[PDB]
RNA sequence: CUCGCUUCGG
C-alpha cells in the first residue's frame with residue numbers, strides 16, 4: 001500500500017451542479033480509478049484525498065464543467081520484499097495459486113525454492129510435510145491494447161519454519 | 167479591476183449560450199420559470215434576475231487574467 | 243485484474259508541423275505496394 | 291431482418307430525398323444514406 | 325509490352341553472388357580476440373558512465389552490503405575549462 | 411431586396427450556443443445602424459414615407 | 461492521467477482501514493442509484509479490501525497507538541520497511557521477527573527481541 | 583496603421599500580405615497555394631492556429647469575437663480542501 | 672450536394688463567413704461550417720503526428736498515443752492530399768486545458 | 769473550386785432553405801414568416817429537460833404531419849434514431865426520458 | 868455520378 005499523486009481533468013455534467021463540487025469530484029474520480037491497474041504503479045484502490053482543486057472551466061463544446069484536480073490515491077504495490085498473508089485459491093502443477101483475501105487472485109508462487117519435497121500432482125497437494133505466508137519478489141506489468149493480467153508478481157516461500165503450520 | 171465594468175455584447179451572447187445549453191441539459195434553474203419551454207428565454211430571465219452562476223475570465227494579451235462575476239458586471 | 247486505460251481526452255490541435263517524408267518513411271506509412279498497371283480483374287465481375 | 295424487433299419487413303422507403311431501408315413494423319431505420 | 329505482376333517482388337531478392345570468405349590468419353584472429361577484450365574491459369572502465377539508477381523502493385540494512393563500489397578517475401581540471409568541476 | 415423575384419437563404423442553427431449568439435449579436439433590433447458611419451439602415455421606405 | 465510519484469509515501473494498513481470505513485459509511489449515507497449502477501466495482505473493491513483488513517489484526521489500532529509504536533521503534537534504528545511490516549503483521553511470536561522479518565543477522569542481538577515483542581504487544 | 587505598422591508601406595496584394603502575415607495556411611488559401619505549401623514544407627515552418635482562417639479550417643472556435651475570453655462555473659466548492667493526516671509519516 | 676434537383680443545401684460563401692466574422696459570432700460560425708456540414712472524428716497519433724485509423728497508428732505500429740479529434744472532413748481531405756504531395760502535415764496535439 | 773475556397777473557407781450546409789420573398793408589413797422588424805412546408809422540413813434538435821417535457825410530449829404525439837411536432841426521436845442511452853411516422857407515437861411520447 | 872457547356876434568374 002502506497003499513496004500516489006495524480007492529476008486528472010474531471011468533467012462534471014451540469015445536472016450535478018447542485019451537489020458540492022468536491023464530493024462529486026471524489027465520486028467521479030473513484031468511479032474512474034476503481035479496481036484498475038495503473039501501469040508501473042499498481043492496482044489503485046480508491047481516493048485518499050483531493051489536495052489541489054483549481055478553477056472549473058466550461059468549454060464552448062460539451063457545456064459541462066472541466067476541473068483539473070490534484071489528488072492522492074491509495075494503491076496496492078509491494079516493495080519487492082513485503083510479507084503478505086494470503087489464502088490458497090487454487091494450485092497448478094507448475095505452481096500454487098494463492099489469492100489475497102478477496103483482494104486480487106493474481107499471486108502465483110513458483111515452486112522452485114522450497115525444501116526439496118516440492119511438487120503439485122494436480123490433486124491440489126500443497127507440500128509434503130517436513131493463513132499462508134508470502135514474500136513478494138518482483139513487480140511486473142503489461143499492456144492490453146495492441147490491435148485496431150497486467151499485474152501478477154512472483155512470490156517467495158523460503159524456509160520460513162512456520163511453527164504453527166509446518 | 168482595470169477593464170470595462172460594462173458587460174460586452176459578446177460576453178452576453180456567450181453567457182446566454184452557455185447557460186441555455188446547460189439548462190437544456192437538465193441543469194438546475196434559479197429563477198422559477200413560469201411556463202417557459204424555451205431554454206434561451208429561461209437563460210435571459212436568469213440574466214435579468216442576475217442569478218447566472220457563471221464567472222467570466224477576461225484574459226489580457228500578455229497572459230494575465232481577471233475574473234468578473236455576471237452579477238458584478240453592468241448590463242444594458 | 244483490469245488495466246486502467248483512458249477512454250477519451252479532450253485533445254485540441256495546437257499547431258501543424260509541416261515537413262517532408264524520406265523514401266523509407268513512405269514505405270513505413272504505406273500499407274501495400276502497387277505494382278499492377280491494370281485496375282479490374284478479367285472476369286465479368288470486374289473486381290479491383 | 292430488423293435489428294430491434296427481429297422482423298423481416300424491411301422496406302426501402304426514401305423520405306424527402308433520403309434513401310432509407312427501414313423496418314416496416316417498429317420503424318427502426320436499418321440503413322440510411324447513399 | 326511488359327507483363328503484369330500479381331504479387332509484389334520478394335522482400336529480399338536472391339543474389340547469385342555471395343560474399344567473399346573472410347581473411348584468415350593468426351593476425352586476424354588476434355584482432356578479433358583483442359576487440360572482444362576491449363569490449364569486455366572498457367565497459368568496466370570508469371570512463372564508461374552508466375545511467376544513474378533511481379527510485380529506490382526502500383532503504384535496508386542490506387544496502388551497505390549491496391552498495392556498488394567503484395574507483396573513480398579524477399579529471400585534470402588544469403586543462404579542462406572551469407565550468408565542469410562538480 | 412426588391413421583391414422582384416429575389417431569392418433569399420434561410421439557415422437554422424442546430425445549437426443553443428449558436429442560437430443565442432445569433433439572437434444577441436445579429437438581432438435585427440441590435441443592428442439598426444450600419445457600422446460604416448452609424449447611420450440607421452432599418453427605417454421607413456416608399457409607401458411609408460409617402 | 462499521469463502520476464507525479466508512485467512511491468510518494470508508504471502507509472500502514474490502519475490508515476487504509478480507517479479510510480475504507482469512512483468511505484463505506486459515507487457511501488451508505490449518500491447512496492445514489494445512477495452512480496452506483498454506473499460503476500459497482502468501487503463497492504466490490506472497498507468491501508472486499510475492508511473484509512481482508514478486518515481478517516488481519518489491524519483492528520484496535522489508533523493514531524496514538526501508531527505514534528507510540530513509531531516513537532518506541534525510533535530508538536532501534538530499524539528501517540521504515542521493517543517497522544511498517546511489524547505494524548501491519550503485529551507479531552506476537554518471536555519467530556516472526558527472528559526469521560520472516562528480513563535483515564535478521566546482527567540486528568536481533570538476542571536481547572532487543574524481547575523489547576520489540578513487549579513494544580508490539582503494548 | 584495596418585499598412586504602416588512594420589515601418590514600410592505594405593500593400594494588400596499577395597506580396598504585402600505575405601510580408602505581413604505569418605500563418606502558412608492563410609497564405610496558401612489566399613493565393614499561390616502550391617508555392618506557399620511547398621516552401622513551408624521545405625522550411626519546416628510550424629504554423630500555429632492563432633489566426634481566424636486557420637481556426638475556421640481546423641474547425642475550432644476562433645479567438646476573436648465571443649472566443650476571446652473563457653467562462654468559469656460558479657460552483658459551490660472549496661479550493662485547497664483539508665487533507666487527511668498521515669499517521670505513519 | 673449543390674443543386675435543388677439533387678436535393679442540395681445552401682452555401683455559406685466566403686462573404687457570408689466574412690460577415691459572420693465581423694459579427695464576432697465564433698460559436699455560430701463553428702456550428703455552421705463544422706458541426707452542420709462536414710463534422711468528422713479522426714484518430715491522430717500524438718507521437719508521429721500522422722492520421723491513424725480505429726484507434727491505431729500503422730506508422731508507429733502502436734496504439735498508446737492515438738487520440739480522437741473532431742475536424743471538418745474537408746480538412747482531412749486536404750491533409751491526405753498534402754501527404755500524397757509529400758507535404759507532410761504533422762499535428763502536435765495538446766489537451767484543451 | 770479548390771479545397772481552400774470551395775470546401776474549406778466556404779462550404780455547403782444542410783438545415784437550410786432558399787425561397788422567393790414577398791412583403792408583409794404586419795410582422796415586426798425582428799420577425800420573418802416561414803412557410804409551413806419549409807418548417808416541416810427544417811428541424812431543430814431540442815433536448816428533453818424538466819421544463820419542456822410536457823411540450824415535447826405533445827409535439828411527439830402530433831407526429832411528422834401536423835405542423836407543431838417532430839420528425840425524429842434520438843434516445844439518450846442508445847443513439848438509434850426513431851422515425852416518428854412509424855410505430856406507436858403515444859407510447860414513444862409516454863417513454864420520453866430526460867436527455 | 869463526375870465533368871464541361873449553354874441558357875436563365877437576381
Ligand SMILES: Nc1ncnc2c1ncn2[C@@H]1O[C@H](COP(=O)(O)OP(=O)(O)OP(=O)(O)O)C[C@H]1O
Pocket residue numbers: 877
Ligand atoms: N451580378 C450581380 N451581382 C450581385 N447582385 C446582383 C447581380 N445581378 C442582380 N443583382 C441584384 O439585383 C439588384 C440589382 O437591381 P438594380 O440594378 O438596383 O435595379 P435595376 O435592375 O437597374 O432596375 P431598373 O432597371 O432600375 O428598373 C441588386 C442585386 O442584389
Ligand SMILES: [Mg+2]
Pocket residue numbers: 411412413414415416877
Ligand atoms: Mg431584385
Ligand SMILES: [Zn+2]
Pocket residue numbers: 716717718719720721728729730731732
Ligand atoms: Zn504514430
